[PDB]
């Protein structure tokens with residue numbers, strides 16, 4: 571389950587500095603632990619936007635300890651994060667991925683943008699074009 | 710931990726065309742005039758069988774392990790997510806009305822959430838699974 575561990579460091583001027591061991595550019599702040607953790611979510615989603623825009627691999631979460639603070643990624647985002655990494659490892663072009671799925675090139679663009687709504691079934695078709703299988707587990 | 714693929718056998722149908730039998734789903738038994746029509750009928754009949762189990766307050770049975778050589782009918786993630794949710798709903802022993810109160814939605818939105826023919830966002834299925842104390846997660850192999 572995709573959970574990014576968060577580091578809270580008391581800020582000298584008050585509040586909590588937010589960092590991610592796995593996500594080096596995600597740096598933010600809140601007055602309280604609760605507000606810091608809500609700032610943390612926005613910083614992680616903004617850092618993802620940059621990895622998608624820059625065509626760079628998104629580092630996976632380090633395993634949690636019992637007491638860790640974490641940000642949980644919802645399945646909409648997690649599906650794309652898995653897809654982006656599988657796409658970049660494949661070294662195919664977006665044109666080639668479109669050709670394999672059998673869709674216009676425009677329709678593949680949404681796959682690599684966290685703010686366009688995309689059916690999980692279209693993410694699954696893309697994963698299959700790259701020789702990968704996406705599956706669901708219920709615990 | 711695997712892809713949701715129901716093993717089927719395909720044989721000549723005694724009254725013409727081809728029959729598709731599911732190891733795991735007696736009610737998904739189907740026929741078509743051509744091999745192609747029988748395999749597409751088997752995809753439709755599988756959904757209709759899932760609805761029967763739900764309407765009967767019974768668990769949808771999960772696939773048996775495949776073989777190298779087995780034919781199968783693969784359920785896409787949209788439908789697999791709702792199959793997992795419907796079983797977890799039945800196991801939860803709460804009413805639809807109680808689920809609707811936990812997620813803050815009118816009852817009518819639960820009716821559509823549980824309809825295997827209705828498109829539902831994977832994030833709304835995950836919110837519903839959480840309201841039943843369950844975690845839905847994605848694996849890529």
Ligand SMILES: [Cl-]
Pocket residue numbers: 688689690691829830831832
């Ligand atoms: Cl979806």
